Amino acid sequence: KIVNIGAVLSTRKHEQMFREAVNQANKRHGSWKIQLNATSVTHKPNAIQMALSVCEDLISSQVYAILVSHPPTPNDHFTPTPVSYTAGFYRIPVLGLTTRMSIYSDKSIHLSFLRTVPPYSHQSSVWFEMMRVYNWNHIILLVSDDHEGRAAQKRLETLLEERESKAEKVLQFDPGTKNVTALLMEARELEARVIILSASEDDAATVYRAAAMLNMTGSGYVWLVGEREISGNALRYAPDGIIGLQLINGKNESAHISDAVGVVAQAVHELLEKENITDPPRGCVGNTNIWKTGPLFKRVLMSSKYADGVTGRVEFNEDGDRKFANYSIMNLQNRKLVQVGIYNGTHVIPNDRKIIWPGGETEKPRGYQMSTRLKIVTIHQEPFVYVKPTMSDGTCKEEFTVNGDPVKKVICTGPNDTSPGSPRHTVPQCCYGFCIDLLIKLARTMNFTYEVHLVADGKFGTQERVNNSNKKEWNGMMGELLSGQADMIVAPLTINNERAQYIEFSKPFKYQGLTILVKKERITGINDPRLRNPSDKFIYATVKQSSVDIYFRRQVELSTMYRHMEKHNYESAAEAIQAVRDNKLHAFIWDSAVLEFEASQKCDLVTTGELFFRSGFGIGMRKDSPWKQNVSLSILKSHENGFMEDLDKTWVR
Amino acid sequence: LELGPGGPRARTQRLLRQVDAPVLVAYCSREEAEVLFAEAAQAGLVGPGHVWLVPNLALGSTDAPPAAFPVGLISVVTESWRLSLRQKVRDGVAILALGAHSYRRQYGTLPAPAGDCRSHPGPVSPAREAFYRHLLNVTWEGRDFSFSPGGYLVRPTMVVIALNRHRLWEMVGRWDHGVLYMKYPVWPRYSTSLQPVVDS
Amino acid sequence: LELGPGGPRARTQRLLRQVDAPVLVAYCSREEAEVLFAEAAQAGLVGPGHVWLVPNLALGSTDAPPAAFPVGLISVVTESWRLSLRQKVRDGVAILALGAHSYRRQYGTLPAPAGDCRSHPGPVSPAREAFYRHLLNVTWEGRDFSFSPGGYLVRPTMVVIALNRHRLWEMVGRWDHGVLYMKYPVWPRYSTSLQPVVDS
Numbered sequence A: 001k002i003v004n005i006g007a008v009l010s011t012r013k014h015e016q017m018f019r020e021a022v023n024q025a026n027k028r029h030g031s032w033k034i035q036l037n038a039t040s041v042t043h044k045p046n047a048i049q050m051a052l053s054v055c056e057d058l059i060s061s062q063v064y065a066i067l068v069s070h071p072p073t074p075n076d077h078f079t080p081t082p083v084s085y086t087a088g089f090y091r092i093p094v095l096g097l098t099t100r101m102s103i104y105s106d107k108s109i110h111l112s113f114l115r116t117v118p119p120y121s122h123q124s125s126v127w128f129e130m131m132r133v134y135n136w137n138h139i140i141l142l143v144s145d146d147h148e149g150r151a152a153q154k155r156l157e158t159l160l161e162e163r164e165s166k167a168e169k170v171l172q173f174d175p176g177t178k179n180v181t182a183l184l185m186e187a188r189e190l191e192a193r194v195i196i197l198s199a200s201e202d203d204a205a206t207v208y209r210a211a212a213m214l215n216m217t218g219s220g221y222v223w224l225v226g227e228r229e230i231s232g233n234a235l236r237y238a239p240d241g242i243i244g245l246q247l248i249n250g251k252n253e254s255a256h257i258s259d260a261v262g263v264v265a266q267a268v269h270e271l272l273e274k275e276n277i278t279d280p281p282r283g284c285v286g287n288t289n290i291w292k293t294g295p296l297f298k299r300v301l302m303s304s305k306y307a308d309g310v311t312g313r314v315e316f317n318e319d320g321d322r323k324f325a326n327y328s329i330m331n332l333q334n335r336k337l338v339q340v341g342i343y344n345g346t347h348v349i350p351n352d353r354k355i356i357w358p359g360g361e362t363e364k365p366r367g368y369q370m371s372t373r374l375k376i377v378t379i380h381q382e383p384f385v386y387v388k389p390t391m392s393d394g395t396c397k398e399e400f401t402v403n404g405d406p407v408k409k410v411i412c413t414g415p416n417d418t419s420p421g422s423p424r425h426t427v428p429q430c431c432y433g434f435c436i437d438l439l440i441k442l443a444r445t446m447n448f449t450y451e452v453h454l455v456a457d458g459k460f461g462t463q464e465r466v467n468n469s470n471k472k473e474w475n476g477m478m479g480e481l482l483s484g485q486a487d488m489i490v491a492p493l494t495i496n497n498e499r500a501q502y503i504e505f506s507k508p509f510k511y512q513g514l515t516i517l518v519k520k521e522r523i524t525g526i527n528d529p530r531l532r533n534p535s536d537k538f539i540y541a542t543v544k545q546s547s548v549d550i551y552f553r554r555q556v557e558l559s560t561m562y563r564h565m566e567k568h569n570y571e572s573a574a575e576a577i578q579a580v581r582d583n584k585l586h587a588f589i590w591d592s593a594v595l596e597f598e599a600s601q602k603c604d605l606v607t608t609g610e611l612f613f614r615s616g617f618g619i620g621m622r623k624d625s626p627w628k629q630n631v632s633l634s635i636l637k638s639h640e641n642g643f644m645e646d647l648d649k650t651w652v653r
Numbered sequence B, C: 001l002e003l004g005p006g007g008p009r010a011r012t013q014r015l016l017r018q019v020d021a022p023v024l025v026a027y028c029s030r031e032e033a034e035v036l037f038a039e040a041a042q043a044g045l046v047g048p049g050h051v052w053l054v055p056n057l058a059l060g061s062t063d064a065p066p067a068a069f070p071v072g073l074i075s076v077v078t079e080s081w082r083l084s085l086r087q088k089v090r091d092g093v094a095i096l097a098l099g100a101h102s103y104r105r106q107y108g109t110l111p112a113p114a115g116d117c118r119s120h121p122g123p124v125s126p127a128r129e130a131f132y133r134h135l136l137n138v139t140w141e142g143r144d145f146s147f148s149p150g151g152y153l154v155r156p157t158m159v160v161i162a163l164n165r166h167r168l169w170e171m172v173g174r175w176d177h178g179v180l181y182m183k184y185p186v187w188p189r190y191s192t193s194l195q196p197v198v199d200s
């Protein structure tokens, strides 16, 4: 039983190393009557003629596997593809020795393909490790629009989902296009200072020069790149201090040849010990069937641990890519690529030298640049945020408390009255109350200035699916905060599970629940028979697109009440309270604090039943906000000493 | 699961013995489909109370289905599934001709023919890129053949077919303009696997 | 599985690669145990995500566990597993002496000596049966040696032992009366040789 192996190499001397390696494997693994034969051909310029020569020289023989190298002249995925098709028709495994493209790891296209060197997509994983080492959470991902960039982005995002984190934003730029500065401009406006680039060498050079022109290479910024962006024309224009990484062997053709021959020999011996091995087709012409053993040979080849390689342990993952590779972390110090670590498959260990960050800093830079100007969206809630017209000269009227102390007020910008009568301009008005005083104390404590504006549509926020939409999106304050119009929500925003998935909440600054307001006390909460038996006689509803609507929608037992309420929901709390007082609405379901304050101050109305959904109000911020901890600590301290009690006495007695 | 010639027949029967569901959606090739359906019948997963839905990959040669395929198996194909080879060839040649017609009418000249197996130019010529663009969106005899950037069809008329009692693939539903049209108000379950009775 | 010495190995290796259970209970002799554990190591069922439990029969001399046995193998033995031969002989002679002493205390005479091989005493001779009954229920040094009518130890004090990292049969739990008292409130798991990996 003679076993024949084939190879497509470049220099015709690599063929001699291939023959020497096959001789070594044939002696180390007992020859007996196994006789591992070796045949080889050289790469050809024309791809079609290369495929035809693959049929005529290698497939014509009883080849069990084909090795394929990469010519020194850069042609990217062009050169190893033809073999992968011709050998892929018959399910003959083909091992790439130096190819790095991610398209060859897609087993639906390149069926019988394996590789001894990981693709570029795996450079994301090592990046992830650094994000764990230096605790970087807010990152920008600058990937090219080609398939390789998309693969890198997908791999990094999948890694981040396990950690349950997210990239700040992803910027896909068309390959080979100039003036990507516009995209970079967006990266400048973000709060993240870490940029992870995945592009070709020319695109890397373009991005480097554009970032240099925009002062993105200064202090506080961190650049993470792969080997494509720190070699060739990219290295010359690379800004100082960037961190790239290189595979240890990478371009060592001979080491990969030896390792591949070793793994192939081991797999061949195992396969012939398995019996029922049939025979390769012996010629492309005539034979139109796949090789029956092919899938079994590939399955044996993938499940192989050749822990004797020149390049270390040789093992494959679920799609043939080399698992557990070694990377060297390189830092550009004074126009020299100094090695400042090694990624040994699972961790990165710093060994020598000192990391020089792009701004010349000698200390680890944080991955964010929290601003001082804070755009704060707020809503008009009667005991928390009073909104009043300002006087003719553009300043708030001086007013003193009943105790005799000045009332702090802020200048908000809101939509004057409802939409039809509005002149459609953000008129400046005067905002004050519980939440405004809390915000003033919080800004004084945390040392940040602010500008306050009202929510455009006057809704707290919910998820809705408009017809002919590909996805649902938050409206109101939640949509404003998620879209970026606001940086922080200072309003009676209820904390619930639906909002918490997309939004970070501070520790509650006020505990309350849900209650029912009625005119003139004949309802026993939401367990009352009339509540569960709706009729046209009894009308009850809440404010549209609020926490109460979310609460009622998510309960199957309350579905009929949800339908009845939805048929008559109101636009705002004040309108529904007025409707209740005007005998137009019988019961109003809302927050305990607002409803209790309304009943106490206005009289003529009473709250009924016990609180049936206890929660609290919290300051809403974007996910993984750097100062979420500081806001929570400040709120806890305010609760502890006296501040919340003082606010309660002053505003809502 | 794991299908294929012979293979490890165990551990697929064990897994198919713990499938408790009224509706099953399967993905496999033709031979793997036959193996899976033989295993499922051995595991009592066919008959009334079980509905199978598969894409076109599992089907092969719609003219003659295997004996292992259960009746009531549901798949979705394109409208040209019932057309003859001559009609398919005519439709494809019509697509090419209409694309050439639109390109000539908009540019004022016939498109340049293709090259050879010789040295390839490299960068794509603007003429080749424009002919491709006019070749994508083509409508012919009412039904449109708009092509995706990925090279497949966008918004085609789709036909939901199912295997009837007579072991023949027959049309059951239509999908035009994003609106389903089914011929059965309630899904018929006339399979004759009531030997255990409890199976239903 | 056959688990015979030097026989069909591919047949059992095929089935051992299809097992997905995280806890495996085995029953075999010592040699079959070694063969089974070797094949399981070849099939990757020995790692930190697999627990093997076997009765006394599978193991042999606990003083020298074989190399094929994985760490964390669990078995249950009697409380005399760590006793020397002299101590066990003393316990047995004590049981016989206490039975004879009870029989004499009730009947006022020592039990009659046993017969001979060159005869067959067809009747049970209730003098013998009474002595057997007295031999059944015996307590000694605060240990219950009560014997079942099936002639084996009933309600005995059992201990649960396991093979630790140093490849020694360490004691883990006790079976005092009908209550389990075992160390290790969380079961420790080792990655093959070392590195006591912790569950995530």
Ligand SMILES: *[C@@H]1O[C@H](CO)[C@@H](O[C@@H]2O[C@H](CO)[C@@H](O[C@H]3O[C@H](CO)[C@@H](O)[C@H](O)[C@@H]3O)[C@H](O)[C@H]2NC(C)=O)[C@H](O)[C@H]1NC(C)=O
Pocket: A251, A252, A253, A254, A255, A310
């Ligand atoms: C790819 O990696 C190969 C091994 O990792 C490497 O082969 C090695 O080549 C070196 C010389 O470049 C040989 O070392 C020779 O010279 C030293 C110094 O005197 C002697 O100590 C050695 O005995 C020897 O004469 C290594 O022996 C050789 N190792 C092997 C296993 O081949 C290739 O050079 C690398 N190819 C590249 C980097 O392109």
Ligand SMILES: *[C@@H]1O[C@H](CO)[C@@H](O[C@@H]2O[C@H](CO)[C@@H](O[C@H]3O[C@H](CO)[C@@H](O)[C@H](O)[C@@H]3O)[C@H](O)[C@H]2NC(C)=O)[C@H](O)[C@H]1NC(C)=O
Pocket: A370, A626, A627, A630
């Ligand atoms: C949340 O509150 C934290 C405590 O007030 C605060 O940590 C403090 O951060 C400042 C930096 O602004 C540190 O000041 C040190 O660093 C600066 C700049 O590097 C130096 O100029 C100073 O001389 C000083 O060495 C404080 O030391 C540090 N306090 C503690 C206790 O660690 C956080 O920054 C706050 N979070 C925010 C604002 O998002």
Ligand SMILES: *[C@@H]1O[C@H](CO)[C@@H](O[C@@H]2O[C@H](CO)[C@@H](O)[C@H](O)[C@H]2NC(C)=O)[C@H](O)[C@H]1NC(C)=O
Pocket: A002, A004, A037, A038, A039, A040, A061
């Ligand atoms: C063993 O491999 C050698 C290649 O080293 C094969 O010899 C080639 O055979 C083909 C077809 O007969 C010729 O086109 C080549 O010119 C030969 N190469 C050399 C260097 O002579 C040989 O056929 C193989 N033997 C077996 C039994 O497969």
Ligand SMILES: *[C@@H]1O[C@H](CO)[C@@H](O[C@@H]2O[C@H](CO)[C@@H](O)[C@H](O)[C@H]2NC(C)=O)[C@H](O)[C@H]1NC(C)=O
Pocket: A178, A179, A180, A181, A182
């Ligand atoms: C590349 O893009 C940049 C940024 O969009 C262009 O620079 C702008 O060009 C417009 C003219 O359309 C002018 O407003 C200014 O010259 C630039 N404005 C800003 C805000 O940058 C540039 O013209 C584009 N083309 C190149 C660089 O060749």
Ligand SMILES: *[C@@H]1O[C@H](CO)[C@@H](O[C@@H]2O[C@H](CO)[C@@H](O)[C@H](O)[C@H]2NC(C)=O)[C@H](O)[C@H]1NC(C)=O
Pocket: A311, A312, A313, A324, A325, A326, A344, A345
């Ligand atoms: C990455 O490189 C390190 C060396 O820096 C490799 O570690 C050595 O690998 C050889 C090869 O088997 C062993 O003989 C040594 O004992 C290893 N040394 C140490 C300290 O572990 C490592 O194997 C390489 N990565 C891979 C996946 O092989």
Ligand SMILES: *[C@@H]1O[C@H](CO)[C@@H](O[C@@H]2O[C@H](CO)[C@@H](O)[C@H](O)[C@H]2NC(C)=O)[C@H](O)[C@H]1NC(C)=O
Pocket: A372, A447
């Ligand atoms: C509150 O913030 C202001 C400005 O944001 C700080 O004023 C300057 O902050 C920079 C930031 O490092 C310092 O370098 C300057 O020295 C500060 N100015 C002065 C006059 O000291 C201010 O220090 C902050 N207050 C704190 C941190 O307590």
Ligand SMILES: *[C@@H]1O[C@H](CO)[C@@H](O[C@@H]2O[C@H](CO)[C@@H](O)[C@H](O)[C@H]2NC(C)=O)[C@H](O)[C@H]1NC(C)=O
Pocket: B102, B106, B130, B133, B134, B137, B138
């Ligand atoms: C099919 O698509 C092509 C490509 O968009 C259309 O060609 C365009 O025709 C308009 C005139 O109506 C020109 O202004 C565009 O420049 C053409 N595009 C290109 C890329 O040349 C063509 O009209 C479409 N066919 C139909 C029937 O609408």
Ligand SMILES: *[C@@H]1O[C@H](CO)[C@@H](O[C@@H]2O[C@H](CO)[C@@H](O)[C@H](O)[C@H]2NC(C)=O)[C@H](O)[C@H]1NC(C)=O
Pocket: C102, C106, C130, C133, C134, C137
């Ligand atoms: C062990 O069991 C034997 C057999 O039941 C007990 O012997 C009996 O003792 C009672 C007590 O007076 C007598 O009435 C019976 O006649 C005895 N039967 C026989 C067959 O001897 C003995 O007492 C038990 N020992 C203990 C410690 O409980």
Ligand SMILES: *[C@@H]1O[C@H](CO)[C@@H](O)[C@H](O)[C@H]1NC(C)=O
Pocket: A213, A214, A215
């Ligand atoms: C970048 O920094 C230089 C340094 O002086 C400055 O002149 C230039 O205006 C900066 N570019 C900006 C702010 O866009």
Ligand SMILES: *[C@@H]1O[C@H](CO)[C@@H](O)[C@H](O)[C@H]1NC(C)=O
Pocket: A276, B006
């Ligand atoms: C090997 O092939 C023979 C004939 O093709 C067949 O009878 C036998 O079952 C096969 N052995 C396997 C599948 O283990």
Ligand SMILES: *[C@@H]1O[C@H](CO)[C@@H](O)[C@H](O)[C@H]1NC(C)=O
Pocket: A416, A417, A423, A427
């Ligand atoms: C705001 O709206 C009121 C209507 O109540 C109007 O009287 C006032 O002039 C408006 N303010 C403007 C347009 O600045």
Ligand SMILES: *[C@@H]1O[C@H](CO)[C@@H](O)[C@H](O)[C@H]1NC(C)=O
Pocket: A467, A468
């Ligand atoms: C779908 O949404 C559009 C958006 O304006 C609307 O005009 C149309 O009437 C909607 N169709 C419905 C509700 O059937």
